[PDB]
Amino acid sequence: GFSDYAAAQLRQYHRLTKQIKPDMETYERLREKHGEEFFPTSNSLLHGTHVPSTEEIDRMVIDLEKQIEKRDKYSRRRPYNDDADIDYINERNAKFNKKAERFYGKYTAEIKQNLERGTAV
RNA sequence: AUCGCUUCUCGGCCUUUUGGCUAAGAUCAAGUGUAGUAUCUGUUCUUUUAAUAUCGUCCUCUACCGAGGACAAUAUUAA
């Protein structure tokens, strides 16, 4: 179940962070260029220095577009059958009756049987 | 088994949805006839007399101009 906005974030982060692959060439290049400060503390100096080249920002933009697509596929539309006896006259009435069947559907299980058998019992 | 695309079923999001209050706010009813508007169907224009109304000249008043009177036919409709 859902239970939190942070647990779905954590699941989504584990997915993205397992999908990524690091490049050791760029890593060792920047390590050899930066030297002493490549293992920084909270307070070293480099906060206002990095300028990423075009390939890095292109990779970030493509990854973020894929992430936006994965987010937009979150609520899949359930298929609409017209064989069920419809009990709504609007477009919002159908979804409100669906919410009523979600919440009160466990309790109001005898009266629907009474209705379908002819208002008896 | 694994990765990808396409049918098919289903779960979770679906308050993303009923946006107040008072004396359930109160009450609980109709027929006929005319007038107006809209739609549909059918078919038309351009190239004498009766009634009503009112530019020129002359006269008077006041400071060429203005007002008032009179006179000279004109317009409409029908055969």
Short mmCIF file of C-alpha atoms (C1' of nucleotides) in Angstrom, two decimals:
data_model
loop_
_atom_site.label_atom_id
_atom_site.label_comp_id
_atom_site.label_asym_id
_atom_site.label_seq_id
_atom_site.Cartn_x
_atom_site.Cartn_y
_atom_site.Cartn_z
CA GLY A 1 0.00 0.00 0.00
CA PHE A 2 0.81 3.68 -0.37
CA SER A 3 1.10 4.85 3.29
CA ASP A 4 3.56 7.71 2.58
CA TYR A 5 4.89 10.09 -0.05
CA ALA A 6 8.45 9.23 1.03
CA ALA A 7 8.28 5.44 0.57
CA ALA A 8 7.29 5.78 -3.09
CA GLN A 9 10.10 8.32 -3.47
CA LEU A 10 12.51 5.80 -1.94
CA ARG A 11 11.32 3.01 -4.27
CA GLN A 12 11.60 5.36 -7.27
CA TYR A 13 15.09 6.43 -6.15
CA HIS A 14 16.28 2.82 -5.77
CA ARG A 15 15.00 2.14 -9.30
CA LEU A 16 16.77 5.17 -10.83
CA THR A 17 19.94 4.63 -8.80
CA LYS A 18 20.20 0.98 -9.80
CA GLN A 19 19.63 1.90 -13.46
CA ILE A 20 22.54 4.36 -13.64
CA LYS A 21 26.06 3.40 -14.75
CA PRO A 22 29.15 5.42 -13.73
CA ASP A 23 31.94 6.27 -16.18
CA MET A 24 35.35 5.51 -14.68
CA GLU A 25 37.26 7.52 -17.30
CA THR A 26 35.61 10.85 -16.44
CA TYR A 27 35.81 9.88 -12.75
CA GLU A 28 39.56 9.24 -12.77
CA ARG A 29 40.09 12.31 -14.98
CA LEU A 30 38.31 14.64 -12.55
CA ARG A 31 40.03 12.87 -9.64
CA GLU A 32 43.50 13.45 -11.11
CA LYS A 33 42.60 17.05 -11.94
CA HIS A 34 41.14 17.90 -8.52
CA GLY A 35 43.59 16.02 -6.27
CA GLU A 36 43.35 16.95 -2.59
CA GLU A 37 39.81 18.36 -2.74
CA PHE A 38 38.23 15.37 -4.54
CA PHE A 39 37.19 13.96 -1.12
CA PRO A 40 35.54 17.09 0.28
CA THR A 41 34.06 17.72 3.70
CA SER A 42 30.89 19.73 4.34
CA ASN A 43 32.95 22.92 4.13
CA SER A 44 35.91 22.51 1.84
CA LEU A 45 35.84 25.16 -0.90
CA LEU A 46 34.11 23.94 -4.05
CA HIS A 47 30.58 25.29 -3.85
CA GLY A 48 30.31 27.65 -6.81
CA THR A 49 32.95 26.15 -9.10
CA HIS A 50 31.61 23.28 -11.21
CA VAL A 51 30.57 23.91 -14.82
CA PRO A 52 29.16 20.74 -16.46
CA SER A 53 29.76 20.18 -20.18
CA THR A 54 26.98 19.60 -22.74
CA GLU A 55 27.03 15.79 -22.60
CA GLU A 56 26.34 15.74 -18.84
CA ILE A 57 23.38 18.11 -19.07
CA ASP A 58 22.05 16.20 -22.10
CA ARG A 59 22.19 12.94 -20.13
CA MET A 60 20.42 14.64 -17.21
CA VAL A 61 17.67 16.06 -19.45
CA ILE A 62 17.04 12.70 -21.18
CA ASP A 63 16.93 10.87 -17.83
CA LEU A 64 14.54 13.47 -16.40
CA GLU A 65 12.24 13.19 -19.44
CA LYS A 66 12.13 9.41 -18.93
CA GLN A 67 11.33 10.02 -15.25
CA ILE A 68 8.50 12.42 -16.18
CA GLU A 69 7.09 9.75 -18.52
CA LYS A 70 7.27 7.10 -15.77
CA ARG A 71 5.47 9.51 -13.44
CA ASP A 72 2.78 10.27 -16.05
CA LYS A 73 2.04 6.53 -16.36
CA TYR A 74 1.04 6.35 -12.66
CA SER A 75 -2.78 6.10 -12.85
CA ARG A 76 -3.74 3.57 -15.53
CA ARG A 77 -7.25 3.91 -16.85
CA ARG A 78 -9.47 0.93 -16.18
CA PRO A 79 -11.47 -0.20 -19.24
CA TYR A 80 -14.98 1.20 -19.58
CA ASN A 81 -17.71 -1.38 -20.09
CA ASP A 82 -21.25 -0.28 -20.98
CA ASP A 83 -22.91 -3.62 -20.19
CA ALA A 84 -23.19 -2.86 -16.46
CA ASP A 85 -26.44 -1.17 -15.46
CA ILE A 86 -25.40 2.47 -15.27
CA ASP A 87 -26.53 4.47 -12.25
CA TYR A 88 -25.24 7.95 -13.11
CA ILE A 89 -26.38 10.86 -15.28
CA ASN A 90 -23.12 12.86 -15.34
CA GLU A 91 -19.38 12.33 -15.82
CA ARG A 92 -18.52 13.01 -12.17
CA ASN A 93 -21.49 11.01 -10.84
CA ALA A 94 -19.94 7.78 -12.15
CA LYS A 95 -16.70 8.35 -10.25
CA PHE A 96 -18.57 9.37 -7.09
CA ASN A 97 -20.64 6.18 -7.31
CA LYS A 98 -17.36 4.29 -7.77
CA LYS A 99 -16.07 5.89 -4.57
CA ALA A 100 -19.31 4.93 -2.81
CA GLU A 101 -18.84 1.35 -4.01
CA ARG A 102 -15.26 1.51 -2.70
CA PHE A 103 -16.14 2.71 0.79
CA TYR A 104 -19.72 1.58 1.51
CA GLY A 105 -19.58 -1.48 -0.77
CA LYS A 106 -18.62 -3.87 2.04
CA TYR A 107 -21.52 -2.82 4.29
CA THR A 108 -24.33 -2.35 1.73
CA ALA A 109 -24.23 -5.93 0.46
CA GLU A 110 -27.69 -7.12 1.58
CA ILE A 111 -29.76 -4.22 0.21
CA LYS A 112 -28.40 -4.64 -3.33
CA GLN A 113 -29.42 -8.31 -3.13
CA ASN A 114 -32.87 -7.16 -1.97
CA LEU A 115 -33.08 -4.81 -4.97
CA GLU A 116 -32.03 -7.45 -7.49
CA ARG A 117 -34.46 -10.01 -6.05
CA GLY A 118 -37.42 -7.60 -6.13
CA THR A 119 -37.32 -5.37 -3.00
CA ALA A 120 -37.91 -8.42 -0.79
CA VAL A 121 -36.31 -9.89 2.37
"C1'" A B 1 15.21 -17.96 -17.20
"C1'" U B 2 16.61 -13.04 -19.05
"C1'" C B 3 15.63 -8.20 -22.00
"C1'" G B 4 12.22 -5.55 -25.36
"C1'" C B 5 7.30 -4.64 -28.13
"C1'" U B 6 2.18 -5.85 -28.53
"C1'" U B 7 -3.01 -8.10 -26.97
"C1'" C B 8 -5.74 -9.63 -21.76
"C1'" U B 9 -7.02 -9.76 -16.94
"C1'" C B 10 -6.43 -7.50 -12.20
"C1'" G B 11 -4.59 -4.76 -7.61
"C1'" G B 12 -3.04 0.00 -5.32
"C1'" C B 13 -3.63 5.77 -6.25
"C1'" C B 14 -8.77 7.09 -7.91
"C1'" U B 15 -11.65 12.89 -0.75
"C1'" U B 16 -8.97 14.28 -8.53
"C1'" U B 17 -15.64 14.33 -6.15
"C1'" U B 18 -20.90 16.05 -3.71
"C1'" G B 19 -17.68 23.85 -1.55
"C1'" G B 20 -21.90 26.85 4.35
"C1'" C B 21 -26.42 28.60 7.41
"C1'" U B 22 -31.64 29.35 8.86
"C1'" A B 23 -38.53 28.01 10.35
"C1'" A B 24 -36.70 19.56 6.04
"C1'" G B 25 -35.40 28.28 4.83
"C1'" A B 26 -40.83 28.48 2.85
"C1'" U B 27 -44.84 26.73 -0.70
"C1'" C B 28 -46.65 23.15 -4.16
"C1'" A B 29 -51.83 24.18 -8.45
"C1'" A B 30 -54.51 25.47 -14.07
"C1'" G B 31 -56.74 26.22 -18.64
"C1'" U B 32 -57.76 28.86 -22.59
"C1'" G B 33 -57.01 32.47 -25.88
"C1'" U B 34 -54.34 35.72 -28.06
"C1'" A B 35 -50.21 37.60 -29.89
"C1'" G B 36 -45.69 37.27 -31.67
"C1'" U B 37 -42.03 35.00 -33.92
"C1'" A B 38 -40.10 31.75 -36.98
"C1'" U B 39 -40.15 28.81 -40.86
"C1'" C B 40 -41.66 27.39 -45.26
"C1'" U B 41 -43.53 28.10 -49.69
"C1'" G B 42 -44.55 30.74 -53.65
"C1'" U B 43 -43.83 34.37 -56.80
"C1'" U B 44 -42.43 39.68 -58.18
"C1'" C B 45 -38.41 44.70 -59.85
"C1'" U B 46 -34.77 47.49 -62.82
"C1'" U B 47 -33.05 50.52 -67.33
"C1'" U B 48 -56.17 62.99 -64.51
"C1'" U B 49 -58.69 63.83 -60.13
"C1'" A B 50 -59.43 64.09 -54.26
"C1'" A B 51 -57.10 65.18 -49.27
"C1'" U B 52 -52.99 67.28 -46.10
"C1'" A B 53 -48.47 70.52 -45.36
"C1'" U B 54 -45.08 74.69 -46.95
"C1'" C B 55 -36.21 80.10 -55.06
"C1'" G B 56 -37.75 85.11 -57.20
"C1'" U B 57 -40.45 90.44 -56.33
"C1'" C B 58 -43.02 94.13 -53.65
"C1'" C B 59 -44.28 96.65 -48.73
"C1'" U B 60 -43.40 97.61 -43.15
"C1'" C B 61 -40.31 97.31 -38.75
"C1'" U B 62 -34.78 96.91 -36.18
"C1'" A B 63 -29.53 96.94 -36.26
"C1'" C B 64 -25.99 94.30 -46.32
"C1'" C B 65 -28.40 91.07 -42.61
"C1'" G B 66 -33.19 89.08 -39.63
"C1'" A B 67 -38.47 88.76 -38.84
"C1'" G B 68 -43.88 89.36 -40.62
"C1'" G B 69 -47.41 89.44 -44.47
"C1'" A B 70 -49.14 88.89 -50.54
"C1'" C B 71 -48.43 87.05 -55.17
"C1'" A B 72 -46.09 83.31 -59.06
"C1'" A B 73 -47.25 76.58 -58.94
"C1'" U B 74 -45.19 72.12 -56.31
"C1'" A B 75 -45.65 66.97 -53.63
"C1'" U B 76 -48.42 62.55 -52.60
"C1'" U B 77 -52.82 58.53 -54.00
"C1'" A B 78 -56.43 56.32 -57.19
"C1'" A B 79 -58.88 55.46 -62.79
#
